[PDB]
Amino acid sequence: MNKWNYGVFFVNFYNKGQQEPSKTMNNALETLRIIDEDTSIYDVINIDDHYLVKKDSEDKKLAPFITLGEKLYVLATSENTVDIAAKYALPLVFKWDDINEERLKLLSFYNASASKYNKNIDLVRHQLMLHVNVNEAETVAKEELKLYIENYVACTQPSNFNGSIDSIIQSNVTGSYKDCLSYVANLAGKFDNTVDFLLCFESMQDQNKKKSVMIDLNNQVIKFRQDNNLI
Amino acid sequence: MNKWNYGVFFVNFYNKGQQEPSKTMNNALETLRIIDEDTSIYDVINIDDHYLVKKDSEDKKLAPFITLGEKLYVLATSENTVDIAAKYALPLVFKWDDINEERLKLLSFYNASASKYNKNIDLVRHQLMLHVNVNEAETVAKEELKLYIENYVACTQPSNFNGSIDSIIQSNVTGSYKDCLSYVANLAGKFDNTVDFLLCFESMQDQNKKKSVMIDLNNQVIKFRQDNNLI
Ligand SMILES: CCCCCCCCCCC[C@H](CC(=O)O)c1c(C)c(C)cc2c1nc1c(=O)[nH]c(=O)nc-1n2C[C@H](O)[C@H](O)[C@H](O)COP(=O)(O)O
Ligand SMILES: CCCCCCCCCCC[C@H](CC(=O)O)c1c(C)c(C)cc2c1nc1c(=O)[nH]c(=O)nc-1n2C[C@H](O)[C@H](O)[C@H](O)COP(=O)(O)O
Ligand SMILES: CCCCCCCCCCC[C@H](CC(=O)O)c1c(C)c(C)cc2c1nc1c(=O)[nH]c(=O)nc-1n2C[C@H](O)[C@H](O)[C@H](O)COP(=O)(O)O
Ligand SMILES: CCCCCCCCCCC[C@H](CC(=O)O)c1c(C)c(C)cc2c1nc1c(=O)[nH]c(=O)nc-1n2C[C@H](O)[C@H](O)[C@H](O)COP(=O)(O)O
């Protein structure tokens, strides 16, 4: 409730970045391995696949409901699909490809709508979806995440790709460790400190890096909690 | 006696019919509180929404995963898929709508594939999805459950509502508590007692039976456990 739960997510696509169709998955099976045996704190896994047109037999967009464990959430996909969520008090799951700016404009309607329906959402915690990529070398990390995406937008019809693939990244989480930690736990802030994270560590090719950037942070939260009043 | 597990699923479609627009969603939310608020045996939830053509520009059908907490699953969408799932020796989620005859011919296919990749399968809990209807007057349910499906049916293209949707209902759980129970138990045996349940109590409108069937199960199972010791 000040205590930040952590989850993991994966996109669902064919041959992300460069990785050969079989490889993308073995990596993702490893990402899950850690979860089970080499960590704790990663307590839920998600599967971003939202780039899809979800409409019934009447060209009617379905209600993006995200399920995490017993809990149920709804993707803050728009101003209408977000307003509505206020109505029933449901928490939102912030998109990954949302320039932090614009995605901030949406927890805004969600404070404004909550108001409207005179709803009391002080205990509703949003979920933030970030694409981590940690490499002591500033720049390798960014040119690596610009491959997980550049593929991803082959599918989605992107106008951005005229002037924006850098911002998404700039919005996402990358660089050395400390600047990664100090960036998110900075961003939490711009979200009135009301979010939990679903962070994709799949741009990261060097498995050993990834396994190390995972159990590090585990051993970090597991402590931060322990250390001072959590569980 | 290995400790069997239970989740809860929800179907996802609009203007159900019989249940007006925000009728369903308002019941849905009531299921949800049952879980959070008065139960302890419902570990996860799910929002089935199968009837889609998870295609893309390239027309490649997307890997139909399903996630239940920190664990990954592969929906028995077909015979290949199951086979593919056989490799990674990932569990399967048998779906509420395939006729028990196909939620079996399919399980059969898995095990063929699996012990044909050397992937040990012993300890692999699969997951059964069934709609439920409970009320002493074991004839009611079938009507209010026949309804739901009859209210959904249209899209999917079921090899039967041009005959009747009596197989599907036959496959799911209609009748009366005391009975129903004994019957799914009877269904677990058809899969070497290594299948877990995902129960969607959303056929039954009277929300009092709902909260009762539910809390009825709960206690009854957490009692069982506290007994033969497993919690
Ligand atoms: C490595 C690749 C990318 C990783 C990205 C995600 C990593 C997880 C983030 C770790 C959190 C970290 C703690 C850790 O290092 O152990 C961490 C860091 C590094 C920093 C700089 C600040 C953190 C913080 N963690 C928390 C936290 O867990 N809970 C919290 O309430 N505040 C935290 N804060 C500050 C909050 O803003 C503030 O303390 C809180 O709102 C108190 O409220 P008020 O001011 O209103 O009284
Ligand atoms: C936990 C499981 C939940 C239960 C599942 C059974 C079905 C529940 C249905 C809940 C309906 C509810 C409607 C309510 O009561 O008013 C409801 C909810 C709770 C939410 C979050 C969204 C709804 C929605 N209902 C509708 C709807 O009825 N019709 C519609 O066209 N869009 C609806 N949407 C929104 C779509 O996002 C939108 O159509 C699409 O994004 C197009 O807009 P744009 O692109 O511009 O964003
Ligand atoms: C009311 C709405 C509909 C509800 C439908 C979903 C829930 C249905 C109830 C099923 C759970 C129930 C739990 C309970 O007892 O409280 C339940 C029922 C009703 C019945 C009839 C049998 C149960 C059973 N539950 C378990 C169980 O949790 N674990 C177990 O190992 N065996 C259980 N069994 C027996 C196994 O089949 C048995 O272990 C095996 O056949 C023998 O193994 P071996 O070959 O090694 O010797
Ligand atoms: C947990 C994170 C997600 C993983 C990352 C996303 C990338 C792919 C992950 C799994 C890889 C794998 C490929 C492999 O190992 O060779 C893989 C898996 C595990 C699964 C379950 C399905 C795959 C699949 N790979 C491919 C593929 O490369 N190409 C393709 O055309 N279809 C692929 N499919 C689709 C099926 O083969 C089939 O076309 C369809 O599902 C049949 O459904 P229906 O007939 O019922 O509609």
Curated annotation (Swiss-Prot), chains A, B:
InterPro entries: Bacterial_luciferase_CS, Luciferase-like_sf, Luciferase_bac/NFP. PROSITE patterns: BACTERIAL_LUCIFERASE. Gene3D superfamilies: Luciferase-like domain. One of its GO terms (molecular function) is alkanal monooxygenase (FMN-linked) activity. Its cofactor is FMN. Binds 2 FMN per subunit. Each FMN has a myristate attached. This flavin-fatty acid linkage is probably the result of an enzyme-catalyzed reaction, most likely the bioluminescence reaction itself. Disulfide bonds: none annotated. This is Non-fluorescent flavoprotein. It comes from Photobacterium phosphoreum. The lineage of its organism: Bacteria, Pseudomonadati, Pseudomonadota, Gammaproteobacteria, Vibrionales.
